[PDB]
Design a protein around this ligand. Structure first.
Ligand SMILES: Nc1nc2c(ncn2[C@H]2C[C@H](O)[C@@H](COP(=O)(O)OP(=O)(O)OP(=O)(O)O)O2)c(=O)[nH]1
Ligand SMILES: [Mg+2]
Length: 500
């Protein structure tokens, strides 16, 4: 048979009939519910920690496990990715992957409104998350072997991979629109980051599916390692609790907001380049091979830390990466129409928010805007909500539908143009005023609602602006002229660049 089929007692019988007949050791296996599937992932040290103090018995135990048909490599699962080719995942990762909480990422478009501008961009967070997991695994492995002095363990590697998988667990419908346009607009009081949702949903994931025990049986320590995983996704003497300062570099792998060089970016750069039809000058495989940990000292008392570093002559590689970063940002991410569509979807959601019910834990009803407060509600919240509204028979959503029908018939707000501030910038508070200002600025009645102003912010490593787009909702010719010249005058008044 397979070990996969084996209950814990089956493993106990196997162990007995293979010579280990001492009830204490069998009790170990019954107690931790070590079903067969775990066996090929057991260590001498794991057997030590579980509590067999027979320095030779552990060896013979593992020998028995080695003799078996099915090995470690025989219980990996191989995904076929067009970005990364084939991809092996350790079974725990699969257990995490195969949950409602995670599978939900199949139904959230990576580029959100993007798909409605770039028909190639049909890809969702699911496959990108897989990719990030895999890449995380690659870099941590490479550093582990090249420098075994680092004491990087299997455990660490799995935690890094899991952090990888789950960095985007907490995105809402249409990805960045939800956490960047809708929630801030619907819950201005609340500060919310998709990462917050990510760690909350991971906590939910492991608990709804009782993977806490499973993690233990694969050699993780849930209490420590879950905090490690969470910390990697979220962020912050030594602030982190998940790992000692001696293992600091691990935190630079999955999310590195400092210098913007991490495996999340690598995957979605490559992937988005793949689907948009853009050629990506950056070979990450070259990066990982020439990646080494080495110590850095900055004097503030001098501080000494272990950062991830790359050979100095692989600086051209980074020039290639940052071009691609800019290339994507310029052409695709801050695309004037994509963002228009995100704005319209948000606008619809806002008008649908009051009436759409989404049940969470104990069946408490939540609104689209508040589902983020209950993971068991948020688990149900996906892009599909777009179509649910659009197709609803509830007549309270007529307002919301009509906006979505306009998206369908390509009847979008008309784009008056872009502008730049010559100096200074616009206070995050000052935003709500802007549609008023444009409306009120005279060169026809034009309400402040008839305008949207879209403010956009354009935005180290170690070796060994503001854009304003104005859209007008009213789509008739005369109002369009009036609005255009309103915008021009508003630009002139604030001493802004001559519109596009
Ligand atoms: N488990 C899983 N596999 C997926 C998913 N998406 C694509 N795949 C691919 C990867 C697998 O290599 C392929 C087959 O996996 P399955 O567990 O469904 O069946 P398989 O034929 O590998 O039998 P096995 O479980 O290895 O005995 O499906 C997913 O969300 N979950
Ligand atoms: Mg990502």
């Amino acid at each position: 048979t397979d070990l996969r089929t084996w209950e814990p007692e089956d493993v106990c019988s196997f162990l007995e009939n293979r010579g280990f007949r001492e009830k204490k050791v069998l009790d170990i296996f019954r107690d931790n519910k070590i079903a067969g599937s775990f066996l090929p992932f057991l260590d001498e040290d794991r057997l030590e920690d579980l509590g067999v103090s027979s320095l030779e018995e552990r060896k013979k135990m593992i020998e028995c496990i080695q003799q078996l048909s099915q090995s470690r490599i025989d219980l990996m699962k191989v995904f076929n990715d067009p970005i990364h080719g084939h991809i092996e995942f350790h079974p725990l990762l699969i257990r995490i992957i195969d949950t409602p909480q995670f599978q939900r990422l199949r139904y959230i478009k990576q580029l959100g409104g993007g798909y409605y501008v770039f028909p190639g961009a049909s890809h969702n967070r699911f496959e990108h998350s897989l990719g990030v997991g895999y890449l995380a695994g690659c870099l941590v492995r490479a550093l582990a072997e090249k420098q075994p002095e680092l004491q990087i363990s299997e455990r660490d590697i799995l935690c890094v991979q899991i952090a990888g998988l789950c960095h985007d667990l907490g995105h809402g419908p249409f990805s960045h629109m939800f956490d960047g346009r809708f929630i801030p607009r619907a819950r201005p009081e609340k500060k919310w980051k998709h990462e917050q949702g990510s760690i909350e949903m991971f906590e939910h994931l492991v608990n709804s599916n009782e993977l806490k025990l499973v993690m233990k049986n694969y050699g993780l320590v849930p209490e420590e390692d879950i905090t490690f995983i969470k910390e990697q996704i979220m962020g912050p003497l030594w602030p982190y609790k998940g790992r000692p300062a001696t293992k600091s570099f691990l935190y630079e792998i999955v999310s590195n907001k400092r210098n913007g060089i991490d495996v999340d970016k690598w995957d979605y750069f490559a992937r988005d380049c793949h689907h948009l039809g853009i050629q990506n000058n950056f070979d990450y495989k070259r990066f990982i091979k020439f990646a080494r940990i080495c110590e850095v000292e900055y004097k503030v008392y001098i501080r000494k830390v272990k950062h991830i570093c790359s050979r100095e002559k692989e600086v051209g590689n980074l020039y290639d990466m940052f071009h691609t970063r800019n290339c994507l940002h310029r052409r695709a991410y801050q695309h004037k129409i994509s963002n228009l569509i995100d704005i319209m979807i948000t606008d619809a959601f806002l008008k649908a928010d009051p009436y759409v019910e989404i049940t969470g834990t104990a069946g408490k009803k939540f609104r689209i805007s508040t589902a983020i407060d209950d993971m068991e509600a948020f688990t149900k919240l996906t892009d599909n909500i777009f179509l649910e509204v659009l197709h609803s028979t509830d007549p309270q959503l007529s307002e919301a539908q009509s906006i979505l029908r306009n998206i369908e018939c390509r009847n979008l707000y008309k784009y008056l143009g872009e502008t730049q501030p010559k100096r200074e910038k616009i206070r995050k508070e000052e935003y709500e005023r802007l549609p008023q200002e444009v409306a009120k600025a005279k060169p026809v009645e034009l309400k402040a609602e008839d305008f949207i102003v879209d403010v956009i912010n354009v935005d180290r490593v170690h070796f060994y602006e503001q854009l304003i787009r104005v859209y007008c909702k009213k789509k008739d010719g005369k109002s369009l002229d009036a609005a255009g010249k309103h915008f021009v005058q508003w630009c002139a008044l604030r001493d802004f660049t001559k519109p596009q």
